[PDB]
Each structure stands twice: as structure tokens, then as C-alpha cells.
Design a protein around this nucleic acid. Structure first.
Length: 862
DNA sequence: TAATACGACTCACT
DNA sequence: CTCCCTATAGTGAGTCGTATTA
């Protein structure tokens, strides 16, 4: 076993030799150098730049080194962070702090000092451990491998790609171990804070801002990027020049997954990855000897998809993302939006200097989001520009605790529009008429043309033939593409589309065409229960038109609206009616008759119901729809000028909430019944085996276990974390005292345990769907390249027709052979419940849907 | 000796 | 009372008592 079985010296050399053995000494070296960048900036790179890093890094190192003298120069206790950091190479501490902090800033919402410190702590730990082997491993690949030139030439531009390594060909010194941290959250946060502290100190890069002082539930301390820095990142070209995301793509095929950890990345002087991302080591250990061949078969095939940067799209992004007004509206503007000026009539205590308190507060909120979207943006370019000329790059993969699959490097195929537009598949095929047809369906889908049947999508593309050519010809001048639903992707398809006109059907096209499942989850529940009406609502049945559940729900809300507008309650007097005098307040019970007309004045379209029906599979029911209706449509309607018909906001939200839940309940009955049945089971397995006095415990609280169709076993175990607060003198100014969840847990959280079951079961269930599909499309058809995004499935156009067939086939198959609920029941039967065991059960009724009809369904991709 | 950093509690919160 | 998102996490000051260390 790696751990022990080998010498730090052997461990350092194994990777490079086996990586040089296949692929060549050059790439093998480059792959390891790339990985080491996660912990240290190579003196070579840095020094060559003579880009923000060229300044940050040196100042931060000097600080760290001066901080150590300061600490050793005094009596008394040494700061806890110091005890751990004393060991780490200062050049590594600085680099990891800089990088981990900027990556955290890519977050709009969460940049509490806990989140940031936690991520620094975590990476600084990875270097304490591993750092020594990393040091040797670099000394190793620096020396030119021994003799034989034909082997070292390795790459050899063989227009056939590097193939993955065979599992058996992997030395036991490459079978990884310990993807879990072993520091106490407390020391992890300590190290983290002191790192941030010195970063602020030595550079003005970030700053600490106190948010909502004196508000028990919202008070917090957060990291903000200094304006001078945001200005350069957004204004200068390549400010993030030498600061790469922690996880980069591989320049050689990724290491195959064989065990529970160690897969994906090749270097041995690194923290290895875990096949499954869990809340704890214990939880990861459960998979240690699981045996789920099909799972590892899926992860490895995907992992093996080869990609390349889409140069034409990169050339455009590099250019227009620096314009002071961009045609792609999703691109974060460059100039700051100044605070809304005070009404001069300031002293005015009306809602004036409270509304302003909001108007301004919403501007800070938008500036933070703007600055983050910008960092994130610049990272993707930093990355695309870096691998631009590479014959190919690969992305290692992971799975979240439910099985869903994730590309591991920040810049990845699962990203937003610009990121996806910048990437395309490495090995393509001559397109063909079949392939060309889907290249067109995809171009249409990239615009907004996806709620119409295929003959129409093609019509859309053909009608706009010259626009599409004008745009591929001169994208900077002909910007009609930048206005399309998915600007950047659409453009990728435009360069491709013209390539076909210029080479005909013999054209080699590798652009990934994507097939998206209607409303995943509502599809899976309809399937497993065979709900005809539910399934038709999503798109399980061959329909002449594309069904739109958000739309059909909306038409139902509206009928209830018109009805309530005619009849329906009248505005009930005042609240002072259940008593005598007093609170004349609640001077308004607004009948359903006035409430309906309010909603009929605003409108209520597909838009009002969409953002409150897709959260259905997240546990949102009638209660939570109201505080979604309030901020998604009412609130922003008021704050924007209109919305004047919602005289009693809360009551209008409360009413719509009811109409929607009411609508969705008759719409997709199945989905509802199954989610409740699932909520019910969770409730009992969570609950504690009590009784009247003799509160003895026959059966404590249990976790929810189940296995997916392809063998992925999953364990839901929410737990209440034991908290605590650290006491840290910050910058010698004040005492920062963060509240933090500890690595120690107490009891099982029965509420979250109940709320998290339905959403987690479908997710896991479409997770293995996705896996079975990757396997099947590769074996029955010859698909080698895959573009995966949970419920979107893509490939090069010459393979689209088979992929399209393969998703249908695979889903139909899994649900005819597996009764996932029934199978679920046979898990928590003997494993759960003891005495009582009743008042819960009753498997929902299987309907009349014929899974076979899915094969012939045009709009039910996935 | 007698400085040092910080966990533990406890309050009050523009 | 939206689930994953290799997740997440009320705050600072006034006071005390401790194990450390130059």
C-alpha cells in the first residue's frame, strides 16, 4: 500500500516514470509541473514575467518571514497559527493564500471570513503533508530521463490521441490515499485567519467588512476585494496572469479510478482526490470495499473525454470582455455604479431615509456580484489562454455524495455560457447530413428556439443563413450572435456552421451538441410511477409540440384567477373583529377577489411560475413558494416602479403561493405523492424509539440508505455540528471571534433529514441514469467523447443521433427493470423501524404510462 | 519574572 | 420551510485564568 510500502524517494519518482513511459518525458514533466502549481509558483515562471502576481507574491512572502521573526522574538505563548505555519515553506504559504483568496472571491454570496479561512487552512494543510514528497518529485522530473530517444519523443504528433493508462499498468505506488484533512477545524481557521491578516497587511489586496452589526441572524464579517485591485483585474489584460485556479485540467489523460481515492491527478506530491465528496472521512470509508464496477466504468470513460480550446471563440472573448460596453449583456461591466445620491432633504425621516437605505444597500450587493463575476470571468480566460495551443486537455472527475458527476477543475465543461463556448471536443468526425442536421438543431437551441418542434428549429437556422455567415465571418462587426440566448456557444456553432458551408459534409466537426432533459426529476418521478399526465407535462410522450410545464401550470393559475375575480371573498374589514377595539391594525384581510385582480393586473405568465416550480424537487411546497413569489416578482416589481397593485404584498404573495402549489399538485400528482411517501419514510428512520416513562432507546436515529440502479450506494446522514467560537486578535485592531462548525458532530438532524430526502433521491437516480448512459453509448454505439452536465448530454455531431437514442434507451431500460421505490422499501424495512412501523407506508400507485413511448419521444432528451 | 495569546463566559446589538 | 453544489459556519468587548518562554 502506497502509504509505507514505498520510500518518499520512490513515491516521488513513480508518477514521472510511468507518465514518461507513456506519453513522453516532456508532457509527463509538464503535467506534474502544472499540478505542483497548486502549491507553489515555479521560480522559472515567476522570474520570466519581468501581471498582479509579480507584486503580490514578493510582498506576502516578506511579510510571512518578518512575521516569524516577530513571533520568535517574544516570550509567552506563540500564536496557534504560527505553530503550524512555522513548518511550511513561506513561498508556498504566500502563493496558496493569494490564489485561494481570489478563488473564494469568485463567490457572489459567501465570502464570510469563515469560508475563506477554511479554504486556506485546507490547502495549507495539503502542503504541510505532501510538501516533502513534492519537493523530491520536482527535483526528480527536472533531471532528463535515461536514454532511448524514441520513448522520450513520446508525444509524436500521431493524429490519434493519447489513450488512458491501463489499470493493471498502475504501480502500487500510484494507488492513492487520504483525501481527507486531519487538522481540527479550529487550527484550520487559525492558520487561515493569520494568512489573510498578513495578506491584508503586506498588500492592500483585500479588506474586512462588518456586515449588519447587531443582527443575530445576519451579522457577519466578510472579505472584500480592494477597489484598486478590482479596477486592474477588470481593466488590464491578464492581471491574473500567473495565478491559476487550484484545480487545472490535465495535459495528458487523467489517472483511472480504481479505488476510493487517488484518481484523476497524477502527481504524488499532492493531496489526492476522493471518488466521492463527503461531509466526512467516515462517510467516505463506507465506499472503501463497495464494488460498483459500472460506476468506475462511467467515471473513467467520461474522465477520458479529450478536449481542446475553441481558438476562434477565445479570440473574440479576449477582445470584447474588455470593452466599456459589451454586446454580451451577461459580461460584467467595467465601471462602478455610484451610490444613489441622497435626496438633499436628508434629515427627512420618512421611509425616504430607509428606502435609500435599501436603494444604496442593493447597489453594494450588485457591485459585489459584479466584482465576483469579473474575477471568475478573468480566471476562465487566464485558463483558456493558457491551454489555447494544446493539442488536447482532459478533465478529471468526482461525484458528490449522491453520485452526480462533476468535472474537478474550476474552468470546466460544466461552466457558464462563455466557458462552454471556449471549449470543444478534441477528436471529431466528418459531420455528414445526419450530423449537420443536429448541428443545426443545436445552433437553434443556443438561440431561444427550443420550444418549437425540430422542423421549425431548422427553419429558424436556414432563415438566418446569412446572419450566421456574417457573424462567423466578422464577429466583432456582426454582433447578432452576442444577442442570442447563449451568446458564446451560439457563436461557436456559427464558426462551425460556416466551416460546413466551406467544406461540405466531409467536414470534420467536433463541437459538442447538447441534449437537455425537460424537467429532470419530474421526469424521473413520472417514470418510476408511470404517470401519464405527469410524464406528458414534462416530455416523456411523443407529442406534436413541446410541452412546457411552467406554461401549463401558469394557464391553471390563471383559470383560478379569473374565477376568483368574479366570485371569491370580499375585503374583510379590520383585524379588530375577533376582540374589542385595540389593534385596529391588520386593517385589511383583502378578499381573494381583490387579490386575484391584483395578480391579473401585474399579469402572471410562465415567468411568474417558473422560478417557483423548479424548486419543487428541492423540498419547496406551498409554504415556501410565498417567500419566493415575494422576492422574485412582487418585491422587484415594487422596487422597480410598477407593482403598485400589491397594496398588501405579503397577502398577495401568500395567495399566489397557494394557487401555484394548488396548480402543481393537480398537474404532476405522481411527483407529489412520491415526494411525500419519501418524506414519510425519512421521518420515521430519523425519529427516536421512545415510549412513556422508560424513555429507553430500542432504535436510535438512523441514516437513510439506498442503492442506485447502477450500483452506487448512497447514505444520507445529516447531523447537528458542535459549534464553538475562536478568539483572534486581528491586525492588532480588534478581536475577531468567528463562530465555526467543528469537525465533531452530535446527533442526527431529523428536520434536514426529512427535507433532504426527496430531492436527494431523484438526483442520485438521474445520476446513475447519466452513468448508465455514458457506459451504454460507449459500448453499444461507438461514442468516445462526452459533454456531461447532470441532465444535459452531448457529443460531436456525427455521434449525436446515437446519443439521442441512447438516453431514451437507457432510461426506458432502468425503469422497466427496477422499481426504485419498492427497492427502496426493501432497504429501510428490516434495517429500520422496530415496533410501531405503520401509518407511514403505502407505495404510491403505478400509473398507465408506457415507458416504451419514451423511445419515440422527440422532446424528452435525457 | 512577567509578558503573551486565547479559550471560556457573558452582554448587548446604529 | 430551496437540494447538491469537496458543504458549512452571528459579532466584538470586558474580564479572568493558564501554560508558555525570552
Amino acid at each position: 500500500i502506497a502509504k509505507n510500502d514505498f520510500s518518499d524517494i520512490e513515491l516521488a519518482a513513480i508518477p514521472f516514470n510511468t507518465l514518461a513511459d507513456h506519453y513522453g518525458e516532456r508532457l509527463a514533466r509538464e503535467q506534474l509541473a502544472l499540478e505542483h502549481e497548486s502549491y507553489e509558483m515555479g521560480e522559472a515562471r515567476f522570474r520570466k514575467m519581468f501581471p498582479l502576481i509579480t507584486t503580490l507574491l514578493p510582498k506576502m512572502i516578506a511579510r510571512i518571514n518578518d512575521w516569524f521573526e516577530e513571533v520568535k522574538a517574544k516570550r509567552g505563548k506563540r500564536p496557534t497559527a504560527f505553530q503550524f505555519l512555522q513548518e511550511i515553506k513561506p513561498e508556498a504559504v504566500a502563493y496558496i493564500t493569494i490564489k485561494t483568496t481570489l478563488a473564494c472571491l469568485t463567490s457572489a454570496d459567501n465570502t464570510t471570513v469563515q469560508a475563506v479561512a477554511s479554504a486556506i487552512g485546507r490547502a495549507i494543510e495539503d502542503e504541510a503533508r505532501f510538501g516533502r514528497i513534492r519537493d523530491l518529485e520536482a527535483k526528480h522530473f527536472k533531471k532528463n530521463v535515461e536514454e532511448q530517444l524514441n520513448k522520450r519523443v513520446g508525444h509524436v504528433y500521431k493524429k490519434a490521441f493519447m489513450q488512458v493508462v491501463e489499470a493493471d499498468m498502475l504501480s502500487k505506488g500510484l494507488l492513492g490515499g487520504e483525501a481527507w484533512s486531519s487538522w481540527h477545524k479550529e487550527d484550520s481557521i487559525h492558520v487561515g485567519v493569520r494568512c489573510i491578516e498578513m495578506l491584508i497587511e503586506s498588500t492592500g489586496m483585500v479588506s474586512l467588512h462588518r456586515q449588519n452589526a447587531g443582527v443575530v441572524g445576519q451579522d457577519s464579517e466578510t472579505i472584500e476585494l480592494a477597489p484598486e485591485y478590482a479596477e486592474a483585474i477588470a481593466t488590464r489584460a491578464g492581471a491574473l496572469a500567473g495565478i491559476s485556479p487550484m484545480f487545472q485540467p490535465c495535459v495528458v489523460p487523467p489517472k483511472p479510478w480504481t479505488g476510493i481515492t487517488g484518481g484523476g491527478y497524477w502527481a504524488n506530491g499532492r493531496r489526492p482526490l476522493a471518488l466521492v465528496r463527503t461531509h466526512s472521512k467516515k462517510a467516505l470509508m463506507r465506499y472503501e470495499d463497495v464494488y460498483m464496477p459500472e460506476v468506475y466504468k462511467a467515471i473513467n470513460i467520461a474522465q477520458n473525454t479529450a478536449w481542446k480550446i475553441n481558438k476562434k471563440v477565445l479570440a473574440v472573448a479576449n477582445v470584447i470582455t474588455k470593452w466599456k460596453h459589451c454586446p454580451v449583456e451577461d459580461i460584467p461591466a467595467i465601471e462602478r455604479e455610484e451610490l444613489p445620491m441622497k435626496p438633499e432633504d436628508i434629515d427627512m425621516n420618512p421611509e425616504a431615509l430607509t428606502a435609500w437605505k435599501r436603494a444604496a444597500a442593493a447597489v453594494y450587493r450588485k457591485d459585489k456580484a459584479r466584482k465576483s463575476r469579473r474575477i471568475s470571468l478573468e480566471f476562465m480566460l487566464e485558463q483558456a489562454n493558457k491551454f489555447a495551443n494544446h493539442k488536447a486537455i482532459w478533465f478529471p472527475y468526482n461525484m458528490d455524495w449522491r453520485g452526480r458527476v462533476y468535472a474537478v477543475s474550476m474552468f470546466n465543461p460544466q461552466g457558464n455560457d462563455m466557458t462552454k463556448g471556449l471549449l470543444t471536443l478534441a477528436k471529431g468526425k466528418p459531420i455528414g447530413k445526419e450530423g449537420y442536421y443536429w448541428l443545426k438543431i443545436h445552433g437553434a437551441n443556443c438561440a431561444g428556439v427550443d420550444k418549437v418542434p425540430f422542423p421549425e428549429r431548422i427553419k429558424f437556422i436556414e432563415e438566418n443563413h446569412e446572419n450566421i455567415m456574417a457573424c462567423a465571418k466578422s464577429p466583432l462587426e456582426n454582433t447578432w450572435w452576442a444577442e442570442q440566448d447563449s451568446p458564446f456557444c451560439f457563436l461557436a456553432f456559427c464558426f462551425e456552421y460556416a466551416g460546413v458551408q466551406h467544406h461540405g459534409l466531409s467536414y470534420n466537426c467536433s463541437l459538442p451538441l447538447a441534449f437537455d432533459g425537460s424537467c429532470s426529476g419530474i421526469q424521473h418521478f413520472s417514470a418510476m410511477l408511470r404517470d401519464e399526465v405527469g410524464g406528458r407535462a414534462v416530455n416523456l410522450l411523443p407529442s406534436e409540440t413541446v410541452q412546457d410545464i411552467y406554461g401549463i401550470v401558469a394557464k391553471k393559475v390563471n383559470e383560478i384567477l379569473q374565477a376568483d375575480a368574479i366570485n371569491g371573498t370580499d375585503n374583510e374589514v379590520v383585524t379588530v373583529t375577533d376582540e374589542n377595539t385595540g389593534e385596529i391594525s391588520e386593517k385589511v384581510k383583502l378578499g381573494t377577489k381583490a387579490l386575484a385582480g391584483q395578480w391579473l393586473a401585474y399579469g402572471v405568465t410562465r415567468s411568474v411560475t417558473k422560478r417557483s416550480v423548479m424548486t419543487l424537487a428541492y423540498g419547496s411546497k406551498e409554504f415556501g413558494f410565498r417567500q419566493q413569489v415575494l422576492e422574485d416578482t412582487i418585491q422587484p416589481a415594487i422596487d422597480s416602479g410598477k407593482g403598485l397593485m400589491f397594496t398588501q404584498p405579503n397577502q398577495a404573495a401568500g395567495y399566489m403561493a397557494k394557487l401555484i402549489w394548488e396548480s402543481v399538485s393537480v398537474t404532476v400528482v405522481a411527483a407529489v405523492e412520491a415526494m411525500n411517501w419519501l418524506k414519510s419514510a425519512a421521518k420515521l428512520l430519523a425519529a427516536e424509539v421512545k415510549d412513556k416513562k422508560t424513555g429507553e432507546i430500542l432504535r436510535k436515529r438512523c441514516a437513510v440508505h439506498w442503492v442506485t440502479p447502477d450500483g452506487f450506494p448512497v447514505w444520507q446522514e445529516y447531523k447537528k455540528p458542535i459549534q464553538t467560537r475562536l478568539n483572534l486578535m486581528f491586525l492588532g485592531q480588534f478581536r475577531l471571534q468567528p463562530t465555526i462548525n467543528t469537525n465533531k458532530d452530535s446527533e442526527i438532524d431529523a428536520h434536514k433529514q426529512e427535507s433532504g430526502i426527496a430531492p436527494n433521491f431523484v438526483h442520485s437516480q438521474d445520476g446513475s441514469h447519466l452513468r448508465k448512459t455514458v457506459v451504454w453509448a460507449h459500448e453499444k454505439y461507438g461514442i468516445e467523447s462526452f459533454a456531461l452536465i447532470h441532465d444535459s448530454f452531448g457529443t460531436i455531431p456525427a455521434d449525436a443521433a446515437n446519443l439521442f437514442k441512447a438516453v431514451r434507451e437507457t432510461m426506458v431500460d432502468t425503469y422497466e427493470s427496477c422499481d426504485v421505490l419498492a427497492d427502496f422499501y426493501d432497504q429501510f424495512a428490516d434495517q429500520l423501524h422496530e415496533s410501531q412501523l405503520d401509518k407511514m407506508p403505502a407505495l404510491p400507485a403505478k400509473g398507465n404510462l408506457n415507458l416504451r413511448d419514451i423511445l419515440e419521444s422527440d422532446f424528452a432528451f435525457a
